Amino acid sequence: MRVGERFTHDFVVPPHKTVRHLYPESPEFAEFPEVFASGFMVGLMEWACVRAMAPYLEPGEGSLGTAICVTHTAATPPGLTVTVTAELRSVEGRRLSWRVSAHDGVDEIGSGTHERAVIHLEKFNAKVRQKTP
């Protein structure tokens, strides 16, 4: 990949990406504005950086999110399309970090940075099986 490479990714927000759908088990979230949850916005931004990454993964490799630092500056109702935009700002071994921005057609809805770690799925799957109680 090349520091400075950009990428872009679109998502029509359905009504089930609101706060209370992120955690159906939260009494508190049950009464939030029916707006796009910060958790999902995270997931989407990761999703974009995952997409950009894919053609460059070798067999048996994968990646994990290792840092997410974004603001969330407008709320996005269902029906809007969120456009995530993802520029590569660094590679340092297996560690890649991006800029992400998102908007919904109407407003700038947040931006910041995301870091991922390229992993070897077998080794990581085994550590995970090890702490599975």
Residues that bind its own copies (CB under 8 A): 22-23, 26, 28-29, 31-35, 37-40, 42-44, 46-47, 50-51, 54, 62, 64-73, 75, 77-80, 104, 106-107, 112, 115, 121, 124-125, 127-129, 131-133
- CB within 8 A of 23, min separation 6: which ones? 29
CB atoms within 10 A of CB 18: 21
CB of residue 75 to ligand ACO, shortest distance in Å: 3
CB of residue 27 to ligand ACO, shortest distance in Å: 15
- Any idea which residue has 């974004």 for tokens? 70
CB of residue 116 to ligand ACO, shortest distance in Å: 7
91-111 b/e (C-beta count within 10 Å ≥ 16 → b): eeeeebbbbbbbbbeeeebbb
Contact region with ligand ACO (CB under 6 A), list: 8-16, 32-40, 81-89, 97-105: 32-40
Three-state SS at 73: coil
Nearer to ligand ACO, 6 or 123 (CB): 123
Identified binder of ligand ACO from the candidate list 73, 81, 90, 125, rule CB under 6 A: 73
Task: Name the residue among 6, 2, 5, 4 with its Cα closest to residue 85.
Answer: 6
Q: Residue 108 and residue 106: Cα distance in Å, rounded? A: 7
- Residues lying near ligand ACO in the complex (CB under 6 A) are found at 19, 35-38, 46, 64-66, 72-75, 107, 117, 119, 123-124, 127
